[PDB]
Design a binder for this molecule. Structure first.
Ligand SMILES: Nc1ncnc2c1ncn2[C@@H]1O[C@H](COP(=O)(O)OP(=O)(O)OP(=O)(O)O)[C@@H](O)[C@H]1O
Ligand SMILES: Nc1ncnc2c1ncn2[C@@H]1O[C@H](COP(=O)(O)OP(=O)(O)O)[C@@H](O)[C@H]1O
Ligand SMILES: Nc1ncnc2c1ncn2[C@@H]1O[C@H](COP(=O)(O)OP(=O)(O)O)[C@@H](O)[C@H]1O
Lengths: 75, 370, 370, 370
């Protein structure tokens, strides 16, 4: 504010801001696929009581037995 | 621990994370490290120099995009450590990386050293009580509630098809070709260079990705539409410049069905699925053709499913009920399935305890992961 | 009786087929004088082209018509072509077929408008557009190798094995001679010699062509140039003024190997060639490391093959025979190759006749370019 | 040793000074050296042959003025030493040079010889214990208190745009034209000779500068003022006469927007800002157009912002918000921001002590400030 009187070249009637007028998905609806609504509650209730037995399993490239099938037991 | 595990969908494009037992991943941010290329002069500027998350997206022009995961394989361990720490920082989760189990997704058929060094990071830098690396296909089936089905996904960088018939994943029919979204985006950048609109900055390649995600429709007839002439609709850049796309909008996403365009002999997505089904047994391919589950963001193109039906009908035997079943939260299916798997009572039995890794090491990791 | 015209972003090397050296060698520059209300009298032209504008450069404004291999002004390029045909070779283009050289990965609009102009404006009977690297390989006397061309506006690498090209392993970089000229102009302004206008750009590029060489060990050479002063040589301007340049000599072509000095966020020419080799097939990389051919005028720097050989040696494996081929006639390799190609007994079927353009139009160039 | 830091804001036309914390520089005067016309042989006239500021403005028709700084480059170092000594003299500060910290300003892309000689003066003659040669755009951003912004300053000799985005100054996006107020006054004198009046002296040239500063308007369309007849607003000369200026008052500031009309090659102020934004990244232009910071005394023309809005609307793409922020303290924004920056506590690491300068010399300056 007092920079007008103490300084010579600080003019008035200056529009400080020169501006312009501040002027103001469809792929899932296909007939090919069957869109499924994912529900974590229903799927969680489905796989709620299904155990997995990991007693002595392997997945690596170890060849000692004939075959190798991990996740043997359940409930 | 008596807490809840963390399901990290360690994808190549969007590293989705969040706590287990949720319904939507609360923290979805792209998988890149942003380092400034300019020189800060005026004080009070931004600091840290390693921008990840919405900070990198909010200011792309300042930083240089560098991806750490190229075709599903971690190429910059320092960048992945920084991204993982960013996930565990106060800006994303506020918890500790030593008081929760970690469910880390991973694309199939990846190198062994990726699993080894990934668990080395999570069990040496971070000292997690339990880590369980897993497939993305099994998790997608977990989220869909199904048990059968051929998971044909296409992320940012790895396309693969893992057929599973009632929880019995066939480890030999799994096909995997490194031709997906990021590579399609790069091919699109090449096409745009041929059109006259060049983009060469790393912070500009994501603008190319936005062009890929907005106006790129897959045509049913490839050469019949290739010989024609479209109306050349326009696009608006973030700068405000208008770009006529032209024929690249339909000739660029054809890379997923013709990998010869990039100059690499391999199979297309449809050949990946058909060969993954044909490498299975006789008494199983009818149900697998009737149970096709999509995933991945690169399957969101216009006309992708229609072209899959046409290609598969060209390859599958006559009079076989083909059913492509994609979900509605396609980008989050793997994370939702990870949430369901980690929220199970049985999940404690299939991980790798910290003491187990300290006793054995890599052998335990390869022993407990597929 | 064929015409070989090499239209680059700098010089316009033109001449007849079968000749060793081209007749027309002039900077492809056009220039309008300083339009003022005053008059001139006793005649003068309207737009000087070639050496006319090069000698009368004291008042006219130099405007190149080609920026990075892209013809940005078809009227100025048409003026240069008219000047070439009817004034440097002194023969009408209707009695001869012409051969134009474009850069690879060039936007299709240039490759088509060039043909439209050569047929509708000059009424030529046949015109073919070849890639400059292919012609450089022709002039190098080899059918196997990678060409590291470097013009003033473009720099690209094209690998050709046994006469077959690899259209996917072709890279392209806009970091060429004109960018080096701008960088040298900025650092000469930093040493106290303001070369502001376009008329001074020819003087700074003359400094670049006369006293600039490629440093072998840039950090060691920079430290010794900052330590000693024997490397600082002198140079005279068109005026009686004399200057001295110390770092600028070797620091000017350093941008070619280190694009970070210009903020390009890209790879240097050595690693551009390295990446272009790595994008090829693994069985033909030995031949590419042995038959690496340099061409263009930007490779005329003294002591550049040593830098390229050292950098590739550090990048390529130890059991490879890194060999750099740099002929002394590499400034005209594209034109010499155009002469060889135009004078071949097989090339007569490789033209594009007038009636072919009358029937198809501008779209026949893409099916007949390469 | 420590005292209140002095912000000696240099410049081609008005050297400004004042202690930190002050919101108004109490000691401002035009930058020149006054010497009488006739060579002194004895006393009885303008003694000492050295007039600066008020004593220089005391007499006009009896002095030959020599500017010490032209286009931001110091030509007469002795004259700048005398002006700096005048700042330390009994009429401007009455303080001690070896006690107060001294901030210094410089236009970008200046030669290294200027900085080295300036530090030789401020560390050998006036042994200042703290010298930091800052820039002239960053300071205007500190004065406005804004992070982003495109600083477009216009002093008496240099007009340059430096788009700084949140404290990050992009050096390769800097456009710099050596045309401003002094040249505006020179071509204004050229047009005044067409009006009918002539000026042929340095002090007479400063009278022309006063003519420029009182009445010089920039219409949006100068052809409309050309077709119509101006009312020829009079101007009372300092000698006592009157001059009816006429159309030269608006024809002269057209230089900064159309320098091609006179015969000089440049881009203009509007194109400096436009090309400075176009050289930036694609993701930052939308924000850099809406953040334009003006500075310098040459941006004080009637209708300057309106014509700049029209020209930027011509060059920038449509529907882009532009905000040419024109502060009131444009003539002192560099000094005000320098005072704000010097008053900071982190500012201690920016300067160089006398012993620190004696350690290396030139390299110490260039390493600590950059
Ligand atoms: N002795 C030299 N040392 C370094 N650079 C040189 C030398 N002679 C010429 N040049 C540079 O080489 C460039 C010459 O360009 P060139 O001869 O490659 O023609 P062009 O217009 O680029 O077309 P093309 O690339 O097809 O030849 C010029 O930019 C010039 O500055
Ligand atoms: N509408 C779309 N069209 C084409 N590609 C898309 C679309 N939406 C997203 N994408 C691509 O899909 C990728 C995300 O796929 P996603 O399976 O999330 O990869 P990741 O599993 O590695 O995160 C992104 O790279 C993006 O390029
Ligand atoms: N009100 C005005 N009207 C016209 N021109 C002006 C005005 N104020 C200053 N100028 C011009 O601008 C110059 C001052 O600009 P400034 O930024 O102080 O230059 P510097 O930074 O070189 O000191 C003066 O030389 C004068 O020619």
């Amino acid at each position: 504010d007092p920079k007008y009187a103490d300084l010579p070249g600080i003019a008035r009637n200056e529009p400080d801001v020169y501006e312009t007028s501040d002027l103001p998905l469809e792929e899932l609806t296909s007939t090919s696929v069957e869109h499924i609504i994912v529900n974590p509650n229903a799927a969680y209730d489905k796989f709620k009581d299904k155990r997995v037995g990991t007693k002595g399993l392997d997945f690596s490239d170890r060849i000692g037995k004939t075959k190798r099938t991990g996740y043997e037991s359940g409930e | 621990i008596a807490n809840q595990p963390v399901v990290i969908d360690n994808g190549s494009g969007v590293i989705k994370a969040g706590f287990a037992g949720d319904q939507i991943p609360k923290y979805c941010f792209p998988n890149y490290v942003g380092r400034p290329k300019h020189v800060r002069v005026m004080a009070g500027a931004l600091e840290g120099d390693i921008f990840i998350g919405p900070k990198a997206e909010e200011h792309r022009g300042l930083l240089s995009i560098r991806y750490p995961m190229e075709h599903g394989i971690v190429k910059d361990w320092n960048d992945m450590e920084r991204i993982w720490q960013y996930v565990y920082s106060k800006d994303q989760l506020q918890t500790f990386s030593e008081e929760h189990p970690v469910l880390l997704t991973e694309a199939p058929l990846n190198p062994r050293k990726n699993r080894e060094r990934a668990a080395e990071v999570f069990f040496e830098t971070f000292n997690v009580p339990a880590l369980f690396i897993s497939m993305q296909a099994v998790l997608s089936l977990y989220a869909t509630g199904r048990t059968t089905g051929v998971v044909l996904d296409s992320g940012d960088g790895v396309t693969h098809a893992v057929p599973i018939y009632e929880g019995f994943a066939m480890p030999h029919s799994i096909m995997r070709i490194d031709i997906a979204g990021r590579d399609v985006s790069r091919f699109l950048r090449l096409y745009l260079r041929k059109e006259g609109y060049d983009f060469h900055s790393s912070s500009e390649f994501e603008i190319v990705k936005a062009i890929k995600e907005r106006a790129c429709y897959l045509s049913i007839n490839p050469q019949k539409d290739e010989t024609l002439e479209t109306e050349k609709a326009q696009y608006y850049l973030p700068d405000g410049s208008t770009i006529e796309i032209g024929p690249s909008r339909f000739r660029a996403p054809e890379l997923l069905f013709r990998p010869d365009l990039i100059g690499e002999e391999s199979e297309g997505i449809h050949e990946v699925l058909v060969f993954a089904i044909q490498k299975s047994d006789m008494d199983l391919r009818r149900t697998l053709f009737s149970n096709i589950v999509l995933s991945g963001g690169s399957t969101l193109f216009k006309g992708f499913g229609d072209r899959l039906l046409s290609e598969v009908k060209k390859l599958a035997p006559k009079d076989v009920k083909i059913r492509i079943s994609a979900p509605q939260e396609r980008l989050y299916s793997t994370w939702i399935g990870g949430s369901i798997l980690a929220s199970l009572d049985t999940f404690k039995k299939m991980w790798v305890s910290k003491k187990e890794y300290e006793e054995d090491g890599a052998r335990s990791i390869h022993r407990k992961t597929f | 009786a064929a015409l070989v015209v090499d239209n680059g972003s700098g010089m316009c090397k033109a001449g007849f087929a079968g000749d060793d050296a081209p007749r027309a060698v002039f900077p492809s520059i056009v220039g309008r004088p300083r339009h003022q209300g005053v008059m001139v009298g006793m005649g003068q032209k309207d737009s000087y082209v070639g050496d006319e504008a090069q000698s009368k450069r004291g008042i006219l404004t130099l405007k190149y018509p080609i920026e990075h291999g892209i013809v940005t002004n078809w009227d100025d390029m048409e003026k240069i072509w008219h000047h070439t045909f009817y004034n440097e070779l002194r023969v009408a283009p209707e009695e001869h077929p012409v051969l134009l050289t474009e850069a690879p990965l060039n936007p299709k609009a240039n490759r088509e408008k060039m043909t439209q102009i050569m047929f509708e404006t000059f009424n030529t009977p046949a015109m073919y557009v070849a890639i400059q690297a292919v012609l450089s390989l022709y002039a190098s006397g080899r059918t196997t190798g990678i060409v590291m061309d470097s013009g003033d506006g473009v720099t690209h690498t094209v690998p050709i094995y046994e006469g077959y090209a690899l259209p996917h392993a072709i890279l392209r970089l806009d970091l060429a001679g004109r960018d080096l000229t701008d960088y040298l102009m900025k650092i000469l302004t930093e040493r106290g010699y303001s070369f502001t206008t376009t008329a001074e750009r020819e003087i700074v590029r003359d400094i670049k062509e006369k006293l600039c060489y490629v440093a072998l060990d840039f950090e060691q050479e920079m430290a010794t140039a900052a330590s000693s002063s024997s490397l600082e040589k002198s140079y005279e301007l068109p005026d009686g003024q004399v200057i001295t340049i110390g770092n600028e000599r070797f620091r000017c072509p350093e941008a070619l190997f280190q694009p970070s000095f210009l903020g390009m966020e890209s790879c240097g020419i050595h690693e551009t060639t390295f990446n272009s080799i790595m994008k090829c097939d693994v069985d033909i990389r030995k031949d590419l490391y042995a038959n690496t051919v340099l061409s263009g005028g930007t490779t005329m720097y003294p002591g550049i093959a040593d830098r390229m050989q050292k950098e590739i040696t550090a990048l390529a494996p130890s059991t490879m025979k890194i060999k750099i081929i740099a002929p002394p006639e590499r400034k005209y390799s594209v034109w010499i190759g155009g002469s060889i190609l135009a004078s071949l007994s097989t090339f007569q079927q490789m033209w594009i006749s007038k009636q072919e353009y009358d029937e198809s139009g501008p779209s026949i160039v893409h099916r007949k370019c390469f």
